[PDB]
Ligand binder design. Structure first.
Ligand SMILES: O=C(O)COc1cccc2ccccc12
Length: 167
């Protein structure tokens, strides 16, 4: 048993809810919250900015020190940092950004990072301002992630569309 509530079960291991991932993280305090990061860990908008804002910029301070030491991530890659006041850990995962011209085939590599964690709270990688088709991102998630993933979909209209089209 775990603490996630009101999710719709899609498969053996994938669950989904219409929820603000920030509000969800604050309530559940999951072991792992996934950030939809970029390779620079510059948390400007979307899930990265919202999460970072909820940490009072501590996520961005930590991230700047990580980049100063290690250099940028790879598209498709990840790193584990603090979850601050939101979670034990934050898994910063870089999905391809279609609005920057990155290869959508890297989305499967991005979701493979989730398999290193038994349970995660996550957004739909490469959806929203990342420019990929969220229906596609949900299908890659289901077909790639084998660990237990709780997907928060911010937009109510998108949530309804994802559920109604899910095979
Ligand atoms: O939750 C959703 O309605 C769809 O996902 C997203 C919405 C807006 C911004 C996003 C940025 C990164 C990844 C997903 C995002």
């Amino acid at each position: 048993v775990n603490s996630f509530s009101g999710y719709l079960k899609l498969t053996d291991n994938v669950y989904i809810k219409n929820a603000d991932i920030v509000e969800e993280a604050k309530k559940v305090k999951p072991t792992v919250v996934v950030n939809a990061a970029n390779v620079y860990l510059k948390h400007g908008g979307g899930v990265a900015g919202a999460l970072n804002k909820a940490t009072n910029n501590a996520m961005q301070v930590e991230s700047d020190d990580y980049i100063a030491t290690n250099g940028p991530l790879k598209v498709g890659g990840s790193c584990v940092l603090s979850g601050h006041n939101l979670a034990k850990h934050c898994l910063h995962v870089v999905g391809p950004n279609v609005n920057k011209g990155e290869d959508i085939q890297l989305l499967k590599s991005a979701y493979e990072n989730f398999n290193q964690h038994e349970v995660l709270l996550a957004p739909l990688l490469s959806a929203g301002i990342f420019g990929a088709d969220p229906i596609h991102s949900l299908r890659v998630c289901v077909d790639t992630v084998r660990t237990n993933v709780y997907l928060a979909v911010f937009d109510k209209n998108l949530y309804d569309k994802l559920v109604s089209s899910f095979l």
